[PDB]
Amino acid sequence: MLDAFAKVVAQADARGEFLSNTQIDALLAIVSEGNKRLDVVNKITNNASAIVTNAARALFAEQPQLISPGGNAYTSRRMAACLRDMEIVLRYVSYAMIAGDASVLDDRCLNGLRETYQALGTPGASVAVAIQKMKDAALALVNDTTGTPAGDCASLVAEIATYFDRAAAAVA
Amino acid sequence: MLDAFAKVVAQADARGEFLSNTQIDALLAIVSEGNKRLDVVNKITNNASAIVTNAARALFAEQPQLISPGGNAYTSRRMAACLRDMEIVLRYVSYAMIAGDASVLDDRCLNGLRETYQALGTPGASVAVAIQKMKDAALALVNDTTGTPAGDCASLVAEIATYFDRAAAAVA
Amino acid sequence: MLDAFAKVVAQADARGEFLSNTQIDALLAIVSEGNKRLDVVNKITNNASAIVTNAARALFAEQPQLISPGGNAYTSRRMAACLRDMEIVLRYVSYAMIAGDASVLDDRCLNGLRETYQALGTPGASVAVAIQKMKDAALALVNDTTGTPAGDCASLVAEIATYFDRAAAAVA
Amino acid sequence: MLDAFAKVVAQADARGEFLSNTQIDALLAIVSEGNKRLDVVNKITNNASAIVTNAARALFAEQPQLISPGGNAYTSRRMAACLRDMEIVLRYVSYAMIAGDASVLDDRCLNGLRETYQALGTPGASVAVAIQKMKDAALALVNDTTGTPAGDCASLVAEIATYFDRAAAAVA
Amino acid sequence: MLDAFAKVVAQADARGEFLSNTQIDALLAIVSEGNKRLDVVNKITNNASAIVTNAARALFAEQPQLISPGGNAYTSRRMAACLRDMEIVLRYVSYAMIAGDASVLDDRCLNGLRETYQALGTPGASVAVAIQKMKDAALALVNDTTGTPAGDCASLVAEIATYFDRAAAAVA
Amino acid sequence: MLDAFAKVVAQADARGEFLSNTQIDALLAIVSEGNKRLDVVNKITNNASAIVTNAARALFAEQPQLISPGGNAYTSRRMAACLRDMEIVLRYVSYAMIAGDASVLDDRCLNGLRETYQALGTPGASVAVAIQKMKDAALALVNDTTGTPAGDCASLVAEIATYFDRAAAAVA
Amino acid sequence: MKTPLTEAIAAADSQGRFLSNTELQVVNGRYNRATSSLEAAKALTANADRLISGAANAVYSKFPYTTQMPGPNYSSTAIGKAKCARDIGYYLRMVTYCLVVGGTGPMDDYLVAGLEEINRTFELSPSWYIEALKYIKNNHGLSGDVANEANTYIDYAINTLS
Amino acid sequence: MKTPLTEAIAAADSQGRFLSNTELQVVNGRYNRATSSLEAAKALTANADRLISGAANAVYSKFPYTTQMPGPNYSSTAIGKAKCARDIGYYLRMVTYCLVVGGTGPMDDYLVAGLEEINRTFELSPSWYIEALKYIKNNHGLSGDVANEANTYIDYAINTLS
Amino acid sequence: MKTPLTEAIAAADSQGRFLSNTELQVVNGRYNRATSSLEAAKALTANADRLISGAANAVYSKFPYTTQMPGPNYSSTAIGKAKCARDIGYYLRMVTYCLVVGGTGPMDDYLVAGLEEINRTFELSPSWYIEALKYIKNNHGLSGDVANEANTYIDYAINTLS
Amino acid sequence: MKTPLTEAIAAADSQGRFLSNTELQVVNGRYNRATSSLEAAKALTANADRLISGAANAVYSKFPYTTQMPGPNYSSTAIGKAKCARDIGYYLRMVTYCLVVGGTGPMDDYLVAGLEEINRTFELSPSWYIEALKYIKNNHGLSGDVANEANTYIDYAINTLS
Amino acid sequence: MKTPLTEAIAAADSQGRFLSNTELQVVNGRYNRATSSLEAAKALTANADRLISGAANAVYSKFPYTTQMPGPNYSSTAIGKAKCARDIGYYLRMVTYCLVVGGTGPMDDYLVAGLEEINRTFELSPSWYIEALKYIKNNHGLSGDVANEANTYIDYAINTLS
Amino acid sequence: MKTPLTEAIAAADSQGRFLSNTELQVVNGRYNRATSSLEAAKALTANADRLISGAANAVYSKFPYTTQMPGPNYSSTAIGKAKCARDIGYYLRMVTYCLVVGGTGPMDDYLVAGLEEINRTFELSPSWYIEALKYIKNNHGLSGDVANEANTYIDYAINTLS
Numbered sequence A, B, C, D, E, F: 001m002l003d004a005f006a007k008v009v010a011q012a013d014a015r016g017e018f019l020s021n022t023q024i025d026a027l028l029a030i031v032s033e034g035n036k037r038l039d040v041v042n043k044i045t046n047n048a049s050a051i052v053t054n055a056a057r058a059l060f061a062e063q064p065q066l067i068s069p070g071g072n073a074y075t076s077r078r079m080a081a082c083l084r085d086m087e088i089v090l091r092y093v094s095y096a097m098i099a100g101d102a103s104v105l106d107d108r109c110l111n112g113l114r115e116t117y118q119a120l121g122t123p124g125a126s127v128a129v130a131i132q133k134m135k136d137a138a139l140a141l142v143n144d145t146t147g148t149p150a151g152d153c154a155s156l157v158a159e160i161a162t163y164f165d166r167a168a169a170a171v172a
Numbered sequence G, H, I, J, K, L: 001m002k003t004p005l006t007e008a009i010a011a012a013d014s015q016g017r018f019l020s021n022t023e024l025q026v027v028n029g030r031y032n033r034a035t036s037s038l039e040a041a042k043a044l045t046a047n048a049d050r051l052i053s054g055a056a057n058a059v060y061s062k063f064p065y066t067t068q069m070p071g072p073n074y075s076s077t078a079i080g081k082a083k084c085a086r087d088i089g090y091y092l093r094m095v096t097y098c099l100v101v102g103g104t105g106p107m108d109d110y111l112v113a114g115l116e117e118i119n120r121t122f123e124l125s126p127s128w129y130i131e132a133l134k135y136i137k138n139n140h141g142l143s144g145d146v147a148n149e150a151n152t153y154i155d156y157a158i159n160t161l162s
C-alpha cells in the first residue's frame, strides 16, 4: 500500500531524482485540504451501518430474486456474507480516501473479486448495484452540515465518487 | 457430506418446499431396512483385513509384474502404500453404505485420484482390479448367516455393488 | 538427494541387481581421489567471501546499468539479495562436488530459477555472467599449492567446471 | 472421563477380575432407567438459557453489590464472563447426569476453580448461590409433565441434586 | 498499559464517577507541556546508540572484572546481551516518558528482572551502575539547545530521572 | 552436551588460558583408544534389542508383582513404556560412551527421573534392577571376540560400568 | 450437514478407522427414534398455514406496537406483514427438516449461522420470534413422544434466540 | 486501555524499537485535538442528569410499551426505570472517558465487549439505546469541533448497536 | 475410556455446547442394545475356564511346535503354558468388558495400545492368538443377537492382529 | 512503505474495522508537521550538490587514508571518489523522501534493509558515513522546527550505523 | 537416500552454510572405511546363491512346520519356497547396498519402511528371517574389519526385526 | 558446543535411535585428523606471544592511522594498544580450541555469536582483524596437514568478517 505521498517518492527513486518544486507544491495542496478530507472520512465512518443496511434493503427491494429460496442472498449465512462484503467495500473506499490513492483498494480487495463471485455463483451485477447505492448514500452524507464549517468539498466528492466506481467495476 | 435424508432436505430447501408425503414415506422405507444395513456394514467392518489381504494376494498372483523389481508395488514402502489404499477404498465404501449416499465417497476419496495415480505412474487398471476383487469378497460375506436372521438382502447388495463400481471407475 | 554411490545403488535396485565388480571398481576409484576432492571443496569453503565479492565487483564494473537507479541490483535490499544468490549457487556447487553428482544442484537450487528470475525481472544473462566469474575465480583457487601436496587435479577441475556450467545454464 | 459402566470395568481390571453377576445386575438397573435420565437431561438442555438468566437475575437482586461500579460483575465483559460460567457449570452437570458419574465434573471443570476465583478476587460464595439457584430451577423443571410419561423420578432428582452441590462446594 | 489519561479514567470508573473539573484541569496541564515532552523523548530517540555505548564503556572502565575471562560480560554473546539490556531499559524509560506514567516500565521491563539476573548470575549492582550512567547522559542531552527553543524543562528532567531511578532499583 | 574434549576447553576459556601440554597429551590418549571405543559402542548398538528384552525378562522373573493385574508393568501400554525406558537408558549410556563424558546422560535424561517415577507410582528400585541387568549384559558382550582384534579393553569396561551406575542411581 | 449418520462417519474417518459397534449402536438409536420424528414432521407440515398464520397473529397480539409503528422493519405495512409471516414459516420449515434428519443440522446451516448479524442489522427482535415458537409449541396438537420430538427442536430454536 | 499514546508504544515495542517521528507526529495530533475533547467532556459532565433523564423519557415517548408492558426487563417498575436510566448514564459516562483519553478504548473495554451477550440474554433492545444516544446528540448544545468530538463517539456507540 | 456416553460428552464439550437430541438418540441406541451385551458378558464370564483351557488347547493342536521348541517364549515349559493360558484369559476378559460398556475402549486402552511392540520384542505370533479367538467364537454357544454382539468384539480383536 | 497514513490503514484493517477517531487524530498530527517537513525538503534539495561535495570533503579531512590507500573500496581513485560522493547523495535523497512522507519508511526500504551485508562484504566503514551525515546536519542552514525535522531523520541514519 | 555424504550436505544446508571441517572430517571417515566395505560387498555378491539357499534351508531345518503346514504363506509349495528364498535374497542384496553407500539408507528406504505392516498382513514371522540372517553371518567367511563391516549391517536387520 | 561427536549424538537422538555405522565412520574421521589438529595447537600455543605481537605490529603497519587517531577505539593509547593485542589473542586462543575439538563450535559460541553488534557499536573494523589473522597464517611455521588444519580455522575467522 502506498498513499499519495509515497507514490510520488517511489517514482522519483526509480529515476534517481529528488522531487521537483512542482511535485512538492502539488503535495502541499493535499495537506491544505487535509481537514476537509478527515471530515469526509469521519462522515462515512460515523454512518457506516446505516449506509450498508439502507443500501442492502434497497437492493433486495429491486432484485427480490436474491432473497427467494435458492437465491444467492437466501439463508442467514448467505445474507450475513453479502452484508459483510458491502461493509468491506465501504472500508476499503474509506482507506483509499484517507490515503489519497487507489492502491489499497485494488491490491487488498478487488484482486480476484470478479473471479470469486463467478466461481461461487454470486451475481456480479447485483454487487455492482449494491456499491452504486452505497456511493449515492455516502456522497449525500459527505455533503451534510452539522459540526462542520460550511464550504466546498466538490473535489473530494469527485474523488470519492471515483473510488466507488473502481470497486463497482471490479465485480463485472 | 450428506446422508440419504439430508440430500432430500437440501433439495427441498433450495426450492423453499416442505417435504411431501411421498418423500416422507420413501425415507420411512430406509428406516425399515435399518437393521439389515447395519448387518451389512458390520460384516464388512469385521472382515476388513481379510477382504484387503486376500484381494491383494489375488491381484499380485494375476499381475506379478507389480511386485517384481522396479514394479509399482515392489519395496516395503510401496507395498504398504498399496495395502493402505485398498483399505481406504473399503472404508469409504462402508461409509457410503451407512450414509446411503455416494457423496462422502466422491468428496473425501475418489476426487483427483486419477492424477494421484497418473502423476505417480501407478496403473489405474490394476487399482481397478483390486476394487473388483474386494467387491466380490464383500458381496459374498454380506450373504453369510450365523448370528444374523435370514431374509432378503438383494436390495442392499445391489447398493454396495454400485458403490464399489463407483470407486473402481474413478481411478481408471 | 543422491551422491555418486547412491545413484548406482538406485539404478541397480530398479533392475533387482547386485552391483558388478566393474561398478565396484569405479566406486573404488572415487574413494581413491577422495583427499583431492576434500582439498578442492576446502579451497572453495575457505575463500567463499572473496570469490563472491570479487566476482560481484567485476560484474558491476562490466554491467553498470545494474546498479544505476532503477537497475535490478540498485537499493541495499536488492544488492544484498544478489550477493546472497551468488552465494547460494557457490554453496550448491560445493555440495555437488562433495557428492560427485549434480542432483543436489538440480533439485534444490536450479529447479525453476529461470521462472523465478523471469518473473522478478532479473536478467538471467547477468546472473550467468556472475556464475562464470565465480567459476574462473574458484578454478584458479583450487589449483594453488600452499598447505597442500603438489599433484594433478585436472580431473576434479573439469568436474567443478561442469557443475558451474550447469548452474549458469539453468537461469537462462 | 468415565461413565458408570466404565468406572466398574476399570476397578475390575486393576484386580484382574471379571465382573460379578451382582455388578452386572446393578448395571442392568441403570439401563432400565435409561428413558427417564434422557428426559431429565433433555429438560435441562431445553431450558438452559432460562435456567441461567433467571438464576442470574435472582443472584443480582439478592447481592446488588456484584453489579455496582467496582463490583465483580460490573462492566459488560465481567457480566458476560459470569453468565458464561453459570452455563459452563450447568453443562458439566448435564454431562455428569448422562455419564451417571461425577468424573467429568471434577476433571474437566471443578479442578482449581478455587484459585481461579481466589486469585481473581471473585466471591466463591456468590458463585455458590448461583449454583444453588440453578439447582432449584432445574429440579423444578425435571418434574414438569407434558410430552413425557408420568412416573417416579425421585431417584434421578437426588442424583442431579448431588452433582449440583458437588459443583457448588468446589468453588467456595 | 496505561498512560496518564487512562490511569485517571480507570480510577474513576471503579468509583462509577465522572471526572471532576480539577482532574480535567490537571490533564489540560499535561497537554500544555506536550511539545516539551515530545522534545525530551526525541533527544533520547535521536542519541540512543551514543547513550548506550558511552555509558557501557564507562561501566567497563570502572568495573573491568566484568570483561576479564569468566566475567559476566566476557565473550561476544554476553557483551551483546548486556548492550541489548541497556537498550531495552532505555526504550522502556522513553515509553514511560511519552505515557507520563511508569506502568509500561513496571509491567514489561521491570517485572522479575532481579529474579532473572539473580538466576543468571548477573550483578544487579553492576546493572544499576549502567542505568545510572544512562540517566546522567540522557539528562544532559535533554537539556541541549540547537533545533529547539530555549525554555524551562526542569519538571520533565525530574520526571525522566524518576523513571531511570525506578529501573535502577528493580534489578537490585 | 559436551564431550571429553569440549569439557576441557570450556574450563580453559573460563580461566582465559590456552590448554597445557599435559592437557593436550591427556586428550591424545583418548584419541589412541578411539578404535577400541568404537568397538565397545558398536557391540551395544549391535545387540540392543537382546540387551533390553533379556534384561526385562529377568526382571519380571524376579519381581512378578510388576506384571500381575494392577502392577506397574501390567497392560500392553505400561509394558511397552517400561521396555522403552530401558532402551532409552541404553541409548544414553551409548551416547555417554562415545563422547567420553557423563553430560548427555545427566542433562538429557536423568534430570527428573526420580521425581517422574515417584509421581507416576513407578517403582524406582525395580528400574535400578533393570539397569543393573542391562549393565551385566552389556559388559559381557563388550568383551566378546569375533570381528575384533584381541586385546585389553579393561579401562573402557570400567568407564562404561560407571555410566550404567550413574543412570541406576538417578531413579532411587 | 451434521446428522447422526454423518457425525458417525466423520468421527471414524477422523481417526482413519472403520466404524465401530459404538457408531453402529448410535445409528441404531436414530433409526429407533425416527418413526416419532417422521410422524411429527408430517403433521406439522400438513398444518403449516394454520400454524404460521396463528403464530403471526400471536406475535401481533403480544406486541401490538409492531402493527402500528412506521418503517420497514415492522408489520405496519403489507410487505412487512408478508415478511414476518415468511420468517415464521422459515422456522417451522427448518424444524420439520431437523425432524427428518435427527439433528439440528438443517436449522444450524440454513438459519442459525448469520442470525445475530442479520437481527442486529435489521433491528428485528428475538422476542418476536420466541413468541411465535411458543405458540406453535402450544398448539401443534401432538402428544406423547411425537410431541417430545417436535418440542426439542422448537425449544432449541428458542435457546438459539435467548 | 487502547489510547493514541499506548498504541504508539505498542506498535514500536512489538517491533522492538524506539518510537519514531511517525509516532511522535501521531501523539502531537492527539495533543492538538485534546483541548476540543476535554471542553466537550466538561459540558457533558455538567449537564449529565439533564441528558440522562431527557434521553430516558425520549425512549419512553418513542416506545411507550416499555413503560406499560409487565416484566423484569421493562421500565414498568420503579426499579426498571432506575436500571434503564442507569444504563443510559453508562453510555454517557463512557463517552466522556473516550473524550479524555482520545480513543474508543474505555467504551470498548468497559461497555462493548460482552454487550451482545448481555443484551440478548436479558432481552434488552439495541433500538431503545439508539434513541437515547440520538437524544443526547440533539441537545448537548455543543458546537464547532467540540460538537464534532462528542458526536464522533456518540455515533460510534450507535454503530456498535448497528 | 471411550464408551458411547463418553464419546457424546466429549464431542458436545469440544464444541462448548450442551448435548443435542442427536447425542440423546445415540445414548438411546446404546441403552437399547445393552441387554444383548450384558447377556453375552454374563455367559462368557461363566464359561471362562472352559473357553480359556479349550482355546489354549486349540492353539497347541494347530501349532504343535510351540509345545516342543525350547525357550521362554514357547509353551514347552510349565511357566510358558501358564503365560499362554493367562494371555488368552486377558483377551476373553477385555471382550466381556467391551460388552459391558458398548465400545472397544477397555480392550483398546488395556490391550491394543503397545501390543505390536510387545509381540515383536517377545517374538510372540499374532497367528497363535487369532487361533484362540476363532475357537472361542466357534463355541461360546450364544445365538441370535447375543452372538452378534460377542462376535463383533472377538472379530475386532482378530482385525487388530491381522 | 510505512508512512503515518498507511500505518493507520493497516492498524484498522488488521482488526477488520473502519478508522476510528484515534487514527484521524494521528493523521492530523502528520498534516500539522508536514509544512515544516516539505520546507526542510525544499532547502535540502536546493543545496544538494553543495552539501554532497562538502560532506565528501569532510570525511576525507577526518580520514586522510581514504584517499591514499590503494584498492577498489577507497577514494584513492577517481572512480573511488565518484562512488563515495554518490553514496552520500543517496543518504541525502532518502532523507528528503522521509521528510516528504513523514516516516522513515523510504530510507528503511531503499537503504537500511540489507546495509549491514553490503558494508561488511565491500569493507565500507559506517564511521565514514556518520562523518558525512554530521556535516550535513551541521551546515544545512535551517532553523526552528524545519531544522528539527531535518535533524531527526539525519539522526536516524546515524543511529542505524550506530 | 541417507548416506554419510548426503547427511553432511543436509546438516550444512539446513543451517544455510558451506560444509565445515567437521563435515569434511566426517566424509574422510567414510573414505577411510570404504575399502573394507566394498571388499566385503564383493565377497558377498560372489557367494550370493550359496548364502541365499543355505540360509533358507537353515530356516527350514529350524522351523520344519514352514515346509509342511498348508497355505499361501508357508514354504509348503514350490511358489512359497521361491518367495521365501526371494525374500532372503532381498535382505542380502540390501546389505551389499548399505556396504557400498556406507549408511543404512538403502535398507531403511527399500526394506524397513512398511515392513511391520506387510509382515503382520501376510503373517510372516520375524523369527524366520532372524534365522536366515544368522546363517549368512556365520558363513560368509569374512574376517577382520571386512567381517566387522558386513556384520554391522546384518545385525542392524536383526534389531529391526527385534 | 558442536563438535563431530556431539553432532553425531544429536543426530541419532533427534531420531530416537542408537548411533549407526554412519556416525561411527564420522567419529573415526575425527580420530584420524585429530593428530594433525593437536600438533597444530601445540606449536600455535608455544608461539602465542610472538604471533600476537607480530600480528598487532602488522595491522599498525598496514593501517598507520590506528595509532594516531585520538579516541577510545584506536591504538593511539597504551590502553588502546593493550585492548587490541588482547583481542588478537582471543582469535588465536579460540582457533586452538577449534583444533582441539575438531569443530568451529568454540569460536562460534565464544566469539562469532554477537560479533556484528559489538564491532558496530564500538566502531571496530573487521579489516583490522583480517590483517592480523593473515599475519598468523603466513608465519606460524607449520607444514603439510598440520598447516592445513591451522589454516582452515584461521580462514573460517576471515570469512566470518568477510
Ligand SMILES: *[C@@H](C)[C@H]1/C(=C/C2=NC(=C\c3[nH]c(C[C@H]4NC(=O)C(C=C)=C4C)c(C)c3CCC(=O)O)/C(CCC(=O)O)=C2C)NC(=O)[C@@H]1C
Pocket (backbone or CB within 6 Å): E032, E033, E034, E035, E036, E037, E038, E039, E040, E042, E142, E143, E144, E145, E148, E149, E150, E151, E152, E153, E156, H021, H024, H025, H028, J033, J145, J148
Ligand atoms: C527541554 C525539553 C528543551 C526545551 C523544549 C521546548 N520545546 C518548545 C517548543 C516546541 N517543541 C516542539 C517540538 C515537538 N513538537 C512536535 O510535534 C514534535 C514531533 C512531531 C516535536 C519534537 C514544538 C512544535 C515547539 C514549537 C513551539 C513554537 O511554534 O514555537 C519549547 C517552548 C514551550 C512550549 O511551547 O511547550 C521549549 C521550552 N527547551 C529547552 O531549552 C530544552 C533543551
